[PDB]
Each structure stands twice: as structure tokens, then as C-alpha cells.
């Protein structure tokens, strides 16, 4: 069982963990930290409705919003083509190849850490100064009250996983490398790469987790629910056309949700 | 979005 090829995997997940610590700064384990009320420096404040939401305050609107959450998104996405350029074998790959999976999968990233951010009672905003409830989200008018609730119902379930940040950066690295992509011109390198990072998250949860037996297809369960999410914009924007009601909205909560995603 | 794939070509250099 330990033999050369497992510790082979073991150095690819501790190569891959200090990557992911160098690309990212906002950690698994410092938003629980926040979230969990640990962290004394300026602890957030809590927005759970517009009252709050008053004494927080420190082109369609709906358009502008994701306009600004995707601006303000940028370093990140950013910090995951670094990070995806640590993955061995990465950097190899046809350039259009490299382009076409993080264009697909910066989004899925993005919810996965957005995760972390939240629990069932809400999110963290405004780089931990704030913290939004879940029902005063849900509570707005449409379109905006049904935006973030299914990533809320993903992140609950994604969280009693107890993924730490050493599983989260194996996890991460397998979404990336996704041989079924649109658009992939040579899917064979990427699939070799992929399976050598699933035989590494295989081994991961093995020693990490000893009370979850089928951990790993559950996380393999969780792509399909990252997708979801994603594809779920589509239809989010068709209903944003279709509204022929008023969707003007408090600027300080168009300022919440360019902080969302 | 073409913008995106401007921003990853770029943060690939
Ligand atoms: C930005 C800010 C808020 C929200 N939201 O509340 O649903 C969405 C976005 C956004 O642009 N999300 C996005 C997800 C996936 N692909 C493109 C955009």
C-alpha cells in the first residue's frame, strides 16, 4: 500500500495543496474562521433586512449586476489559470485546449469557493466586513429573490462534506481538467491527466476522511451539481427578459450582489 | 464570452 506509485500521489497532492495556497489567499479555513464568529478583528456585520441594510451602508439592473460580479471576478479567475498552470502536464496541452477548460471551468471554481463563504443562514461579503442572510436574498422581488437560493441549497450539502483546503485543491485541479468540454480539440492528454489526479484524490479522502465511505463518488456527484448551477444563468437571463415587472432594486443590494455569483 | 477567454489568454502569457 505504500509503495513508489502512492507516494508518487501523495507528492502530487502536496504539490498541488502549497500551489493552491501560493494562487489563493481567501482559504477554506479562514472564511469558517469568520463565519463560525472566530476571527475578533472587525467581526461582520449582519445585513438580514432593509433596515439593516441601511445601517450597513459602511443597462437593466440585473445586466449590470452580473456585469460587475464578472469584473469583480476577474483576479480570481486570474488566480485559477495560475493555479491551473501548477497542474503537471497542464501547460503541455494546445493553447486553445488550456483556454477552453478554464473558460468552463473558472464558473465551477468560483461556486466552489463561494461555498466556503456561506452557511445556511447566509454569505460573506464586502471581504468578510459583511455577512447576508439567505432569507433576506430570498425575500426580494423577483427576478432577484430566486438568484442566489439554489447555490445556498448546493452549498449546505457541498459543506457536510467537511472538505478541508488540501481536498478542495485535488477537487479543483479535476474539474479543471475535464475531458468533456465543448470545444476540446485533443481530449486524450487531458483525460491522462485527469485520471492521474483522480487516482490522487482517490488516496486523499481515503487518509483524510475515515467516516465517509463513497466520499469520493459523492464529490464526483457534486461536478454534476456545479454544472447545473452554471447553466442555470441561461435560463436566469431568459427570465430577466421575460419580466415585465418592476426590477428596480436598492443600489446598496445591487452592491451585495456584484459581490455574489 | 470573449472577454473571459481575453482575460485567460492573457493571465496564460
Ligand atoms: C454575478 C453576481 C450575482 C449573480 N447572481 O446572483 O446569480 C450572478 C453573477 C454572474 O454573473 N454569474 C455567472 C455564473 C456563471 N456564468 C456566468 C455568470
Known amino acids: ?261 | 464570452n470573449l472577454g473571459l477567454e481575453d482575460i485567460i489568454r492573457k493571465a496564460l502569457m
Open chain 1, 1 to 261: 500500500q505504500l509503495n513508489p506509485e502512492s507516494a508518487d500521489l501523495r507528492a502530487l497532492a502536496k504539490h498541488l495543496y502549497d500551489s493552491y495556497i501560493k494562487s489563493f489567499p481567501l482559504t477554506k479555513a479562514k472564511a469558517r474562521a469568520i463565519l463560525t464568529g472566530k476571527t475578533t478583528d472587525k467581526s461582520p456585520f449582519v445585513i438580514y433586512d432593509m433596515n439593516s441594510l441601511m445601517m450597513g451602508e459602511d443597462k437593466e439592473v440585473a445586466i449590470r449586476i452580473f456585469q460587475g460580479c464578472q469584473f469583480r471576478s476577474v483576479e480570481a479567475v486570474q488566480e485559477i489559470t495560475e493555479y491551473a498552470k501548477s497542474i503537471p502536464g497542464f501547460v503541455n496541452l494546445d493553447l486553445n485546449d488550456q483556454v477552453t477548460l478554464l473558460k468552463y471551468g473558472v464558473h465551477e471554481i468560483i461556486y466552489t469557493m463561494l461555498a466556503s463563504l456561506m452557511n445556511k443562514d447566509g454569505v460573506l461579503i464586502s471581504e468578510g466586513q459583511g455577512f447576508m442572510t439567505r432569507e433576506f436574498l430570498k425575500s426580494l422581488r423577483k427576478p432577484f429573490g430566486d438568484f442566489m437560493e439554489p447555490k445556498f441549497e448546493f452549498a449546505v450539502k457541498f459543506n457536510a462534506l467537511e472538505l478541508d483546503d488540501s481536498d478542495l485543491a485535488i477537487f479543483i485541479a479535476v474539474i479543471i481538467l475535464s475531458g468533456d468540454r465543448p470545444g476540446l480539440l485533443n481530449v486524450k492528454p487531458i483525460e491522462d491527466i485527469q485520471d492521474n489526479l483522480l487516482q490522487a484524490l482517490e488516496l486523499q479522502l481515503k487518509l483524510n476522511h475515515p467516516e465517509s465511505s463513497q466520499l469520493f463518488a459523492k464529490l464526483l456527484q457534486k461536478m454534476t451539481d456545479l454544472r447545473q448551477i452554471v447553466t442555470e444563468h441561461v435560463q436566469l437571463l431568459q427570465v430577466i427578459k421575460k419580466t415585465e415587472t418592476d426590477m428596480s432594486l436598492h443600489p446598496l443590494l445591487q452592491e451585495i450582489y456584484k459581490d455574489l455569483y
